[PDB]
RNA sequence: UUUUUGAAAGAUUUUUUGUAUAAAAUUUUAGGAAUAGUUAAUAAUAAUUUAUAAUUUUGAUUAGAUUGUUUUGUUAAUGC
């Protein structure tokens, strides 16, 4: 009475029921409309896949663009958390402070057995790919979901500086990948996503947290603008944050 | 005549051709109609070959409340008739029911007792058939039945199949086919090996036969008022079994 | 089976080599929501709508399709009748069956279904709540049934529903709940128009799987 | 399979038939009637296309003369000729592979081209239809056998492939020593 | 489909016969496979001239306005009988008589003894409808030797055209399961003075010459002139 | 045969039988009432058969 | 079509056929060199 | 000749209800009071009532209420047969029963003869066990007839069931009471109880 | 009813033939793949026998096929060289896997090219495994399915005869055959088969076993059909291809003919194709049993 | 105004599969303007979900004539 008769929205055939089933045999009733839903529509940011081996091993170098002091990114992520927390008393522990902010450009399961020589080579790549670029000026605008749900971001937008930073990243990651056999996530031919994570579920909350953060809590903000924001500094960083706040500063690059 | 692939016609929200659920009704004689084939096999089976749980020594005991975990599936053939716990027992003498179990008793003990069995929770029944006296079946020392002492014993040995199932439940969750293994009777060879073996002279040839062979009775055509020429009308030899193109024995 | 052994097999096997790179993502492709026929059908998740002559990578499959045979009471208007009602759920791999069947509630769309507390089965014995589906082994494959805490009595004729073409339905059979709406007396539109099947539709006796006749 | 049949041209089953070989042609004065022999559908809408499938030929069932050729002193050219053009690589495609079934005026004419075998209505009504009888048939069978050797060539070279790459012919197609 | 006759010819239409498939021939229209019918019609054509002046009683003729002299009444129980067994008795009015409600016993419609044919229905239970002459009679069919193996539920029973030459060994009472039939073959090894077997699936019986006479006479070998 | 049908409104010679309706096709409209019931003693005086029958016996 | 032989089984009836298809054994017997000379063809 | 497609589909497989052309039209609003009147008419109501949405054959409950609340006749039950009688015409003569009688039944019903009248009912009785509900009779029932037919004097009734014998669900007659109906015994049978013959 | 019914969610006729039960040559781990390499490089031995001589290879088609033809013990000597070149390229490895695949061919190999005894198959098999068994742990290794198939297919060869000779209706036989003795192995081994639990049996096991019978004269080859093959496996029309050479045995066409027809009655009812050997074996002398072997419309166009 | 084998062709010893509704181009009348169960996304939702919605002067909606895209007539011929 107010729409189509038979609606497409509706207009669905599924082919991993057999043949002839639906027709005579069974009916198979579900809610279709959620397995055929956009990453558009859910948040699916479709980070490099690590394979096995590297999976099962935690991160343990990454490589970051370090935030200047005096943000917008900062300011509008503090607003950010303060509705985070008026909505939800329940959603402090889930998220990332502040001090621990960067910005994520590779990840790298280091062995110490070959920590400090591998690190040293690792710089050389870094600062000659980084020597004659220019201070980066970068987009932060809505949010995506890592783990399935499990990590909010604030992804960089491809849209001022992407080509010349994943020319960048991917050339590091080729060359810790292939030249250096280190373990950089996933292939040494692929190219990381770069990301701000801003929240996260981890191993230690996934048992009374969950395994997907719930999207109600900051789904009005999955497309909202954060901020352009420059940059000068990439730093590979051991995970260990600790330190002063910010991770173990095991090397900077300027800009 | 063959299959078509996807319902593309209606809204599956409202079941529209389907073909409906079958579901096996203890009350009625539906139950052992399907039900009661299946036991022969299983006869068949564990008159052949040792299989572990057929076997048991007694009962189950389990609480009421993981009954219906382990049970539901479970069949298993006792020395003697008794009730498992937390249940009651109803004989049943209804002889359309009771009819099915001929092919049973005519390969094997003839059939002496048929119960179902309702648990206390009333959702679990077990149709238990007792048999009774010396098996037919050639039943081998490696078997399970022959650890079960009959054929160790002498006449008079009343073992007695149990199974279980939840009740109203489609011929699927009667998990009484994953034993048709089909295993042959050796004891048919092993006649060639012991005493016999001097004893039994084999022919290997044919006997010249000066006699051709005697012919049937003549052929008195039928006098009824024929149904027709069986082959156009896709009627099958007896409308029992054949090929339709092989229309012997159809008046003719 | 020949398929799900052999890329169980190899699924195992790929993990089973440590020396392997990660997949280029941007080299494995999707599936195109758009494509060329009519419908916005689904294929499997091997399975592109184009052509993808590549034998990509076998993935482990996070969120599994879980198939509940339920039983719904249908009203061919010659009786009630007993059919086959899957509900297909996409259901993850690390779930307790206490939370799969909390999601079959909130999946369902016949409400018919879901009025009284349920549980699960395969091939007979019962699942607990407290254990998750590879506690059993649940694949998208596993002949599930589905049991309702009214099942063991459908043989019965106490709460068998009342129709109208053998049974008197009262005025409070008026108010409850198939029958309010199920439309007893045909409107000039016959309102609620449901299926219908003959009292000679099978032959003298019912629908099993052996010949009878 | 229709609430209300329509009465004088029903056929056995289904809206789309299968295909049929007729051969229709126009009913108007003799003088003026000759036939289109037309592979086509047996539930037809009122026209021959809409489940035409392939035109087949024409034919004359007039019998013409040899004007096309010179006055032989010989009997058989000089009688009339009646004349047909089939499409017999499309026929053979048809009825061979799709299997369209051959109705019996067409036949009556494909019969005398020679593809077919003269239809089962070509009847000499002048001699009778047959009496079988299984002692006969089979003391034949006995007296004249063929054997397996013989027949399962035939078979597969009949309805199965027959371009036998000649064994040795099969040398053209083994290289030689630059890749052997 | 499945099983039409030569294969799947076309030198015309009906080298398939009147149904091409034993199966059904739509997965909608379950009842339309091809059973062995007989004829409903003629076979229920009871003959109401044995029934006519006879003064039947109805069962709403139970007044004592509409009884009538027990003579009359036995000329009506006579009449109905002879009404019922006009064209043959229901095998429910066949094995209602014979001891144990015939259970075992081995029962034939006529046909099932003419011709190659050679066919009997060792039944295997008879539950019987208010109504009698109607109900539920299964069987364990046996053709030609060979016995199926579980009870079937016997086709037309509840059509008058049944025999049976009841045999005491059969009778098998309400308490023991019927022991279903040897076939001749698998149960019982064969004996060739015993039984033998009438035809086999090659078999047909050499022309009857009356039949071959009647043919070569109409079809004008045989010349037949008044 | 075909007589039979004739009488048929099957608009096409069916073989089927089509019941032509009528537009009085109910005896609730047709005029026809209820069965009147005969009086019970009407019913239960012995027949006369049966009462010749009845003295027939003290001889 | 399927023949209506004058010598076919006569249902004596007045609502369906006043003949039904019931060959007389002549008829099984002579349909056979029928269906035959054709399976010849 | 198939009528699936002029009526509905569940009216397919519809056969002895005349003219089914009423019910396809029974929810258009004037033939819908048309029934709400033929079913007044029938009765055994009280509110109004149409047979349901896709039912011709009316239903089997109202059908049953019907049938048990027709009233059964002979209002004048005197004689053991009369109350026997009702109760049978209750008993295998209500509404869809399953039950179908003995023969040990018609046994009692056959005692309860004083006249002529229980004559003709328990022979009816008789006739509906023998033809009707399809039962064996025992071994000696011509035995509990002969004297039932004896009890009001009747020999032609006796003669006639032994001269026409097969009919009438009496297979074993012995010769006794052949000869004795006859005149070539002047006796049947001897009442070994008290050793007496008759 | 008339039969079990093979169905989808379950089989109920057995097999025909009895698989290897494994994975792909493509799946094997590179030790395994090194038996699987033998294994291959044997079936093509084999095959290359049988194309070389099809006279040799088919079972009982003259005395060719019990003359060991020249030129096999050669390659039979290639043979184990390659038996023992893999036996000694693996050692405590060449014990942890899967070597019924390549023990199969082995016993098929010897068993074709050369011409031994079943028993000679059955102690071979067990050199072979206690060979492989002595390696490392304390143990031996059963056996599977097919591996006994070569078994029972080496009886079957044993007991064959040169039948119908242009017009010999006689069984030739070969020169010194004892049943007693063989049967009596026969019997010794399938004890030892279905003693076996894990040895499930298939129609290509029964139907040299009932060939078996059949050679050996027993006259109770057909007992056997009944209550072991008949009824409960996916026949075929070779079981009666060959049962038919035990009925025609018997000392009296009464018996003869009888059985016959009993068994055409169990094709049509198990749905089983009478091949054209079937056929011909009856008509071979249908003039002495009148059994009709043709259906009239296959008679008639026959004639015609 | 568009759609398939699952009917049938149609062949075997059994359970046997993935090919369909969508469109795309062309649309009349002298004086020419407003039209409406509405558009998209969610949806196997909302007779009261969300919204800056959709058709139109590139001639919309109403109303008018009109059967829609290898058949003719004329003409040397685009045409008409």
Known sequence: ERGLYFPINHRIVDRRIASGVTVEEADVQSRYRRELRTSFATGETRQTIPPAWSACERPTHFLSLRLPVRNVLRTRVNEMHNQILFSHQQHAPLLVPLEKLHITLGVMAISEREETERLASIYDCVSEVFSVIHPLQLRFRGLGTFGFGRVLFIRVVPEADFGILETAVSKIRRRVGGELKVDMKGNPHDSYVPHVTIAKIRSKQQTQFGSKIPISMWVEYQHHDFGDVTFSQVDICSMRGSKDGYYHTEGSVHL | ????????????????????????????????????????????????????????????????????????????????????????????????????????????????????????????????????????????????????????????????????????????????????????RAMALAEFNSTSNTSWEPKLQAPKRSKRVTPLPAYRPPQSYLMGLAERLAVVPGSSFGRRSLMWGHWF | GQYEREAFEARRRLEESKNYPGPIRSATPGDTRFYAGSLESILQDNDRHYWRAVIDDPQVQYVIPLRIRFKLFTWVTTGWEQRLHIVQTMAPRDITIARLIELVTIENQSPYLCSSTFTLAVDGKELDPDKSLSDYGITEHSRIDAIEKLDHLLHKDSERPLDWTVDEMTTECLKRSPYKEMGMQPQPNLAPRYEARPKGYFGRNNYSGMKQE | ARAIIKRRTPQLWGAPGAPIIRMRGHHVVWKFQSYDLFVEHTHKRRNSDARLLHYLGKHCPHPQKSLWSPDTPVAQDRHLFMLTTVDVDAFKYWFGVKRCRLSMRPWALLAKAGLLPPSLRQNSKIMPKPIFDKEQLMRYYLANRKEEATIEREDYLNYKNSLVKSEEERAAERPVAPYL | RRDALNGGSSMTLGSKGMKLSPDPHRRRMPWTAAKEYVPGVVLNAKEKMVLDGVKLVDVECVDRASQVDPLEALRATVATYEYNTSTGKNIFQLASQVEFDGRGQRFYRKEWQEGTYDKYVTLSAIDFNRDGNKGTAYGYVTFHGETTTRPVQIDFADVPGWHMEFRVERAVPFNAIVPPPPSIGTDVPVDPRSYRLRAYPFYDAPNPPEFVERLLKDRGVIPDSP | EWLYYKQFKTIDFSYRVIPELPEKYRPHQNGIDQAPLPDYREINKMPEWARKEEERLKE | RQLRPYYNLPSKSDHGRKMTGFLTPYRHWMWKQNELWRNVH | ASLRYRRPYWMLFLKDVDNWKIYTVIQQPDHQRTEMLYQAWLGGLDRPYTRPKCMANQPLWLSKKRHILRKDRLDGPETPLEKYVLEWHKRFHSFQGTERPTVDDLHTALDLVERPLDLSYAFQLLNQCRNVNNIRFAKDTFLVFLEACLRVDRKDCALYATENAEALGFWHIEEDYRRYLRGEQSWYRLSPLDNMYY | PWRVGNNGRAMALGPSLTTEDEMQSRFFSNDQFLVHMLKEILRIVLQEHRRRHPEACSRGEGEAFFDQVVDARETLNFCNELIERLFAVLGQKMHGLNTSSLLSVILELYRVMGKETGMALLRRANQFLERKAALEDGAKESLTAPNYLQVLMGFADESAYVYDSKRKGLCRYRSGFDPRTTMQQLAATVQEIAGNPHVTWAADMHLQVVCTMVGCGTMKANDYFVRNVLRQFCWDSRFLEALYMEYRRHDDVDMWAELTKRALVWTARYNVNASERLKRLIEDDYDTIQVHTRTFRELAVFQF
């Open chain 2, 1 to 184: 005549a063959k299959r078509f692939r996807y319902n593309t016609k209606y809204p599956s929200l409202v079941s529209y051709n389907k073909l409906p659920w079958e579901i096996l009704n203890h009350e009625t004689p539906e139950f052992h109609m399907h039900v009661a084939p299946h036991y022969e096999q299983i006869m068949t089976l564990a008159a052949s070959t040792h299989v572990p749980h057929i076997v048991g020594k007694k009962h189950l005991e389990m609480p009421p409340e993981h009954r219906l975990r382990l049970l539901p599936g479970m069949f298993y053939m006792l020395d003697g008739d008794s009730i498992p716990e937390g249940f009651t027992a109803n004989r049943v003498l209804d002889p359309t029911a009771l009819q099915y179990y001929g092919r049973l008793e005519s390969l094997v003990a003839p059939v002496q007792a048929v119960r179902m069995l309702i648990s206390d929770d009333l959702r679990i029944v077990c149709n238990s058939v007792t048999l009774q006296g010396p098996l037919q079946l050639p039943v081998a020392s490696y078997a399970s039945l022959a650890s079960l002492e009959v054929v160790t014993n002498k006449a008079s040995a009343s073992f007695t199949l149990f199974h279980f199932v939840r009740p109203n439940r489609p011929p699927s969750e009667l998990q009484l086919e994953k034993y048709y293994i089909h295993a042959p």
